[PDB]
Design a protein around this ligand. Structure first.
Ligand SMILES: [Ca+2]
Length: 130
């Protein structure tokens, strides 16, 4: 499913992402935007390391979910990568929260540093009533 901007913003707020481990809602919106374009079915194969990025947050199969075909992989979220491709982002969110609980936090996603860090990210939540 492809979310509309404000519809996702309101969903994330309900799911408790605003201020999670110090990360503002606008940051999470910025990340979802550059990672998947707000598409829950998004998938990216990394030919280079044989891992795949899944879902709205492009969660990588080497560490966070199990797809069975990633060598030397762990499944820190205790989820099938499969679960990150449906239309319900409740587990995606629970997993994203798990990612940022690691030392690195949101920096774990290079697109955040490239596209969101030290930027005015208000654009992503303006007018959404969140
Ligand atoms: Ca899901």
């Amino acid at each position: 499913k492809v979310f509309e901007r404000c519809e996702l913003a309101r969903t994330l707020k309900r799911l408790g992402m605003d201020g999670y481990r110090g990360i503002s809602l606008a940051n999470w919106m910025c990340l979802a935007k550059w990672e998947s374009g707000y598409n829950t079915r998004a998938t990216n194969y990394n030919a280079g390391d044989r891992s795949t990025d899944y879902g709205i947050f492009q969660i990588n199969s080497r560490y966070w979910c199990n797809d069975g075909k990633t060598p030397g992989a762990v499944n820190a979220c205790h989820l099938s990568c499969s679960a990150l491709l449906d239309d319900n982002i409740a587990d995606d969110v629970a997993c994203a929260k798990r990612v940022v609980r690691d030392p690195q936090g949101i920096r774990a996603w290079v697109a955040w540093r490239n596209r969101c860090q030290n930027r005015d990210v208000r654009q992503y939540v303006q007018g959404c009533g969140v």
